[PDB]
Amino acid sequence: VSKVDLLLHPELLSQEFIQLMLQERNIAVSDPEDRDRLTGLYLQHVIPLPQRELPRSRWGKRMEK
Amino acid sequence: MESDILDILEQLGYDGPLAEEACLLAECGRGFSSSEYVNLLTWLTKQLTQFTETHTADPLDVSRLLKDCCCPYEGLASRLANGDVKDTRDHLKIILFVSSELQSAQLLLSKTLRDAEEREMRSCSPLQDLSVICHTLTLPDPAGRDPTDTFTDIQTQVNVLLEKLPETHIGAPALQRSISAEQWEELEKINSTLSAEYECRRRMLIKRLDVTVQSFSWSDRAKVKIDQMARAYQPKRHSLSVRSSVSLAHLLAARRDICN
Amino acid sequence: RSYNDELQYLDKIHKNCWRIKKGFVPNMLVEGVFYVNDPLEKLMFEELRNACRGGFLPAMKQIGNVAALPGIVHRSIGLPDVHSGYGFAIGNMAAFDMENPDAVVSPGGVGFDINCGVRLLRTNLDEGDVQPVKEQLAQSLFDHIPVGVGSKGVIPMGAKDLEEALEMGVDWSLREGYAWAEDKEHCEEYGRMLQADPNKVSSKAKKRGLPQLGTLGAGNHYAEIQVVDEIYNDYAAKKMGIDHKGQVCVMIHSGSRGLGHQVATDALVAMEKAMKRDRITVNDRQLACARITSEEGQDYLKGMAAAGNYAWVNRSSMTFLTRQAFSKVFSTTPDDLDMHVIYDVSHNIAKVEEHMVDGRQKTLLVHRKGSTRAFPPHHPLIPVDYQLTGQPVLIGGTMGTCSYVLTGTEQGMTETFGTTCHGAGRKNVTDVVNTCHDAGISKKAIKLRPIAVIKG
Amino acid sequence: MFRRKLTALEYHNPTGFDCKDETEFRNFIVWLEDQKIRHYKIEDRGNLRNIPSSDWPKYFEKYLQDVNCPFSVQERQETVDWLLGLAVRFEYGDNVEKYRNCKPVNNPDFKAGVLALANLLKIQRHDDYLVMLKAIKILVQERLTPDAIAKASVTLDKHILGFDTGDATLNEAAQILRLLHIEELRELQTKINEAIVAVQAII
Amino acid sequence: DILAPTVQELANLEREAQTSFLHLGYLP
């Protein structure tokens, strides 16, 4: 419960913690001083997303049943 | 694996008799003997060869494509070339692989085209402004056209909506007095310092929002409703920007209504 | 001292500004001033003459004693409603520079009732619409809001809820759903104080103030409803959301209940002991002062911040209760009624501002007892609506006289550190408002007249 | 190998991916689960998120069985390809029509026209021939739009500039710039209020 | 550290905004 709350808010994370996550996931980092690039990379690759709604295809119908 | 292949075919769109699971299973069990199978393989492989940089469903050609397209299935290429394998599972696997590769190639090409057009838009050129005006005034795209022709077109277009609306709609400019070229450097400096100060103010506002949402996140219900909070907060929050977009063009285009 | 020997120490700068030079009281550090018109001069001078001819010092002498504490910069200021009170005079203003280690805080400077203030709500109805159901509305407001000594808040609370409210403030009230997102915008300090520690509050205060939340209390606290009477600034009134006369508004005047008083007393009892070690002597034993960089000073600052957050939570809860009552009476959603909040000012808080003195920037901790903060237009701590007209200042009076809505000015920011009056005090509210307007420290925009008042 | 499929899904290391690695495979699996598939909730993925534990493969089997994948981890490459195809299919099911049709395959009169257009729309002349063109762009976008045409049917000195540059004509421009900046800041504040309301509506 | 001090840096931002506001139009 703590880890998901930590990963879902890049705004409150420290610079060092964001850099540690980016290095742990083996993500290439350029201009590490700038916060904007680090936040962009974190939002593009690391942040989780909510559950996707069931697709209209047959797989979604099978999953619903 | 029948469901996955049927879903892929429905996504790609097929008018053949493959919409029935039983017919597809029977055709796959038949193997390369069915003309439907070879026709479908040719239909997929022509587009797959068109999409790949290196540019008849005989086993040799499709096996060569599998070798070229970095097909990762264990022994599929060699066994397909030899023809020893006749199991229907191999047929399902090869159909699935080729269809998924075609779908991925289409997605890659579409994303590359979108990125290229976005990069072209990013350039600070009159073309972006002209395209914006033409799109918002239902006019043909001026790109690739004579500039005088497009200018006359937009000129003639503007009046037909000018008189339809009341005259007191556009209004008079708020910047009434004439400004010489000497004062423009000082005006630019004033705009720059104002922009810096208001950027700082905007950043402080965004940080206040950050603190408020952090205080929110410690609620007891905040630990059980993570999905809804993420879905309703991430896209709203990650669209705000600290940069101030006011420029001298806004000053020139400002009308008397903003100065009331 | 002789009366003429006393009055030899007073002079005038201009029509609406006197001046008390050094020597009025021992060990002064800078001259004092006060803003009074002709009617106010008579009252002040009669008080001084009678004092020179009771156990309470005169207002001018209390200004003088305040003008001697270490670290004080610029001049001691007496707003047109200044009158005698415990420690600092009621309506007296003083700012201390944090850079000087000799600077001190004062529990009496902030006040016993920490962070009591006025919040205004606008409503799109008219006087002729409320009047037919005026009695029903008054009864519903009286029954819905628990007002009186010993009354308990209708909504429940516990130790965890109280601790969270002390830590956060309006954020807690807005998270539970008691206040909209707009309420946090139109609040001084944006509704909460950044530095605050609930564990710096004595547990006795927390125990005492647990059932007191949402309760108006006795004294000058009320939740009255009134009608707009006149508009002096059309642009300011339009910005505030009041365009035509006859509009309905509701002001809630409320304090910190028992947390503020208990924090003040528990800080004073230790501050007096710390004074002996700190080697600080002043004219009056009631002027408690210890260094800013001290355990007692920091503890009092944190306790006062927690009391302010509690008072803001109480005011937000009162706003929610009033909104619910109005919605139930008029059978309409409160958002449709446009029951927003114009502003929320606090006149019993000391805050760390960044005024400019003698052309040199300085970070000043400012005590404001009985006086309301005002800021000039374009200040970066005012809502976006009021960035062109200046911060609203609401003169919360009592039953009878009409409350006022002034706005700050550029002159007041550089002259009186952006501070204006906060009521008549223990005088005429109209005279005080006129004195503030003529002195260049405010300008009136709306005048509101009461119809119904809810007291205890 | 998996290069095109990963690139279509916008992977951060399209080339450096290796299927046979131990930790990096789990990192990729968790990235695909929380980014390109999104089956469960964020909080439920915790057991799958824990990378270095020795009990992780059991949760991997549970995840593979839940999505009803025809294969298992006995063939790691098989499941990698199937999951990549599933993610690409999920991305495909947004706009089928547009994705199906993809197939690889200082002038004086300009300045005169811009000047005429600016004169028609009451825009003051400027030294640079591109600034007033941007002015026409903003004006047309703000006023010549379907919403504005559908909705078609205090003095300047009364405001406070907050300072004084000492000029009589630059003061008006400073006031206008201040008003524009205030309007942008108000727009940002409105968005912030909307976000706070949306978040608090859940609780 | 796993978390950053947000309230302190918010106070710093507010102070910086006040300094900029004073420097713009109150400089003698």
Numbering used by the authors:
A (entry chain F): 18 to 82
B (entry chain D): 1 to 55, 62 to 266
C (entry chain C): 3 to 55, 60 to 432, 476 to 505
D (entry chain E): 1 to 105, 124 to 171, 179 to 228
E (entry chain B): 706 to 733
Sentences from the paper on this structure:
In archaea and metazoa, tRNA exons are ligated by the RNA ligases RtcB and RTCB, respectively. The metazoan RTCB forms a stable complex with four additional subunits, DDX1, FAM98B, CGI99, and ASHWIN. The RNA ligase RtcB catalyzes the GTP- and Mn2+-dependent ligation of the terminal 2′,3′-cyclic phosphate to the 5′-hydroxyl terminus. Here, we use thiol-based chemical crosslinking to confirm the involvement of specific residues of RtcB in RNA binding, and we present a cryo-EM structure of the purified five-subunit Danio rerio tRNA ligase complex.
We next obtained a 3.3 Å reconstruction of Dr-tRNA-LC-TR, which was used to build an atomic model of the complex. The structure was similar to the AlphaFold 3 prediction with rmsd of 1.8 Å over 964 C-α atoms. In the structure, the enzymatic subunit RTCB forms contacts with every other subunit of the complex except for ASW. As predicted, the C-terminal helix of DDX1 is positioned between the RTCB subunit and the C-terminal α-helix of FAM98B. In the structure, FAM98B and CGI99 form a highly intertwined heterodimer, as confirmed by our coexpression and purification of the human counterparts (His6-MBP-FAM98B and CGI99). In our structure, the C-terminal helical portions of CGI99 and FAM98B dimer interact with the α-helical region of RTCB (residues 340–393). The same part of the CGI99–FAM98B heterodimer binds the ordered N-terminal region of ASW. Moreover, analysis of the electrostatic potential of the surface of the Dr-tRNA-LC-TR (based on our cryo-EM structure) revealed positively charged patches, located near the modeled position of the tRNAIle molecule, as predicted by AlphaFold 3 in the absence of DDX1 subunit. We obtained a medium-resolution single-particle cryo-EM reconstruction of the FL complex and a 3.3 Å structure of its TR version lacking the catalytic domain of DDX1 and unstructured region of ASW.
